[PDB]
């Protein structure tokens, strides 16, 4: 095999590739790939070993050797002016109309997503980069078939780019015969095309980093960012990242993550679905760590409330933001029909604000004014809650963070998990990873927790609350039955013309396997061109 330091591209270039994959952009991407891919692969190997140690009976806990970091005073390098107020952020796909609508919403920040809300088709990833460049430059516009034009209002929301996680390949670009990291592809191109214009207008190149498991992964990101800064003669800490704590391993390393990325990091985030998905994956071999219906595993449960409070305390100790989670409801256009949903949003966001979160997430612009009002009321004239130290909280321990919550494993819950996961997967394999299902805007994490919970019940031979043993056979029977329910709900035309056969097959494959696969997106990606 050759010692090549060049990339290969599997797709022929059209107009879009000529815009994004310029000679200079590809030279920069190539440098990042050759400099950082070997270490990325070693990090993925380290994950395998850490998980083996947990499987073999040693539960996660804080790191003893780094006690000196945790018990010293220090803060992050800094937060730029336009990231000092992030009370509401909207998340969404990098599709052109969606980008315009999100930037125009009454929010502080739009997180444009190449990760869980994107089915990463090559054309969609390239189009996404084209759209974000046009958005940064202020020119992005879209005219629909009815002749309505969509353009940016004055003073759009601040833009932040979420990259693919460390496990994901970008299969259309290879180095030494192997797919390059999608993380590097997404980072390199958004950074390269936009850093100059972002900085000139008083903003900067900002990223969201998903699914981190360790401080060493954060250190890798800081090396990538420092390389990019140095390459274009930017001061250290020009690139700013917000990092989701949405894996169980990461909740024990938040302070070390903040330290390893201290030049670049400006906040951490709580979430629900990726985190409990990870809880199950991480504790997959523990018979006493079986979670009940994921629908019942709510943020107020002791282990999740401990996670929230620890994240807030840790972030604020270091002068970093502590972001709350997602309200994914799709409200009616008629306000008279939204009372129940908006009351739920108000209750949930009030809980977060009262706990000390600096901001929170929505998926739909119709929730912006409600979410903003909750934070406006509790913040008063404050921009954020960085001064909320939670010093009165007792220590939070691993036992508390690991304690499975009360609840039932129900047939209704299991069937609902099947319907939601299958409908998500059907949309994803058709190219849409941000999917309205039963009034919620769902991303991949919803399908992940749904299939992983069922896997856990099968693996540990658990009964449902009605006494039925959960088995592969029971799941297969229920799958067939719920496919008929989906068909009735959507109608013959939508169902027959859809990709539900293929979605059910993938769901069956990922749920009934003896081994718990890490991510459904890996086998799913094989179905994309
Ligand atoms: Mg070099
Ligand atoms: Mg450094
Ligand atoms: Mg997530």
From Swiss-Prot:
Keywords: Cytoplasm, Glyoxylate bypass, Transferase, Tricarboxylic acid cycle
Pathway it works in: Carbohydrate metabolism; glyoxylate cycle; (S)-malate from isocitrate: step 2/2
This protein's GO CC annotations: cytoplasm
EC number(s) reported in the record: 2.3.3.9
Active site: 162 (proton acceptor), 443 (proton donor)
Localization annotation: Cytoplasm
Pfam families tied to this protein: MS_C, MS_N, MS_TIM-barrel
Catalytic activity: glyoxylate + acetyl-CoA + H2O = (S)-malate + CoA + H(+)
Entry's Gene Ontology molecular function annotations: malate synthase activity
Source species, domain of life: Bacteria
A biological process term (GO) from this entry: glyoxylate cycle
Family the UniProt entry places it in: Belongs to the malate synthase family.
Protein name: Malate synthase A
Organism of origin: Escherichia coli (strain K12)
């Amino acid at each position: 095999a050759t010692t090549t330091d060049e990339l290969a591209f599997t797709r022929p270039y059209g107009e879009q590739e000529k815009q994004i994959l310029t000679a200079e952009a590809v030279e920069f991407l190539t440098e990042l790939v050759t400099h950082f891919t070997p270490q990325r692969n070693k990090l993925l190997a380290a994950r395998i070993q850490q998980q083996q140690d947990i499987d073999n009976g040693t539960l996660p806990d804080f790191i003893s050797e780094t006690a000196s970091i945790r018990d010293a005073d220090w803060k992050i390098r800094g937060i730029p002016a336009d990231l000092e107020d992030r009370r509401v952020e909207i998340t969404g796909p990098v599709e052109r109309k969606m980008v315009i609508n999100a930037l125009n919403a009454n929010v502080k920040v739009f997180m444009a997503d190449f990760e869980d809300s994107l089915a990463p088709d090559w054309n969609k990833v390239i189009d996404g980069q084209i759209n974000l460049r046009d958005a940064v430059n202020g020119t992005i516009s879209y005219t629909n078939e009815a002749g309505k034009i969509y353009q940016l209002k004055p003073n759009p929301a601040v833009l932040i780019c979420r990259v693919r996680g460390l496990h994901l390949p970008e299969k259309h670009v290879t180095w030494r015969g192997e797919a390059i990291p999608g993380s590097l592809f997404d980072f390199a191109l958004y950074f390269f095309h936009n850093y100059q214009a972002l900085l000139a207008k008083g903003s900067g190149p900002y990223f969201y980093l998903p699914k981190t498991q360790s401080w060493q992964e954060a250190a890798w990101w800081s090396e990538v960012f420092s390389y990019a800064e140095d390459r274009f003669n930017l001061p250290r800490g020009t690139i700013k990242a917000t990092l989701l704590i949405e894996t169980l391993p990461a909740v024990f390393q938040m302070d070390e993550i903040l330290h390893a990325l201290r030049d670049h990091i400006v906040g951490l985030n709580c979430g629900r679905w990726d985190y409990i998905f990870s809880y199950i994956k991480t504790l997959k071999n523990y018979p006493d760590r079986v979670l009940p219906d994921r629908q019942a595993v709510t943020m107020d449960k002791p282990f999740l409330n401990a996670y929230s409070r620890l994240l807030i305390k840790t972030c604020h100790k270091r002068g970093a933001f502590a972001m709350g989670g997602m309200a994914a409801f799709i409200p009616s256009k008629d306000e008279e029909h939204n009372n129940q949903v908006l009351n739920k949003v108000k209750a949930d966001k009030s809980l977060e604000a009262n706990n000390g979160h600096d901001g929170t997430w929505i998926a739909h612009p119709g929730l912006a004014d409600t979410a903003m009002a909750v934070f406006n009321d509790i913040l008063g004239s404050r921009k954020n809650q960085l001064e909320v130290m939670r010093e009165q909280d007792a220590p939070i321990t691993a036992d508390q963070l690991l304690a499975p919550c009360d609840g039932e494993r129900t047939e209704e819950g299991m069937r609902a998990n099947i319907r939601v996961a299958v409908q998500y997967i059907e949309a994803w394999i058709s190219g849409n990873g941000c999917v309205p299902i039963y009034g919620l805007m769902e991303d991949a994490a919803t399908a992940e927790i749904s299939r992983t919970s069922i896997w856990q019940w099968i693996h540990h031979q658990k009964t449902l609350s009605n006494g039925k043993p959960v088995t592969k056979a029971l799941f297969r029977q229920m799958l067939g039955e719920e496919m008929k329910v989906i068909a009735s709900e959507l109608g013959e035309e939508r169902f027959s013309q859809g990709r539900f056969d293929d979605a059910a097959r993938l769901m069956e494959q990922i749920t009934t396997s003896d081994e718990l696969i890490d991510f459904l997106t890996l086998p799913g990606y094989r179905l994309l061109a």
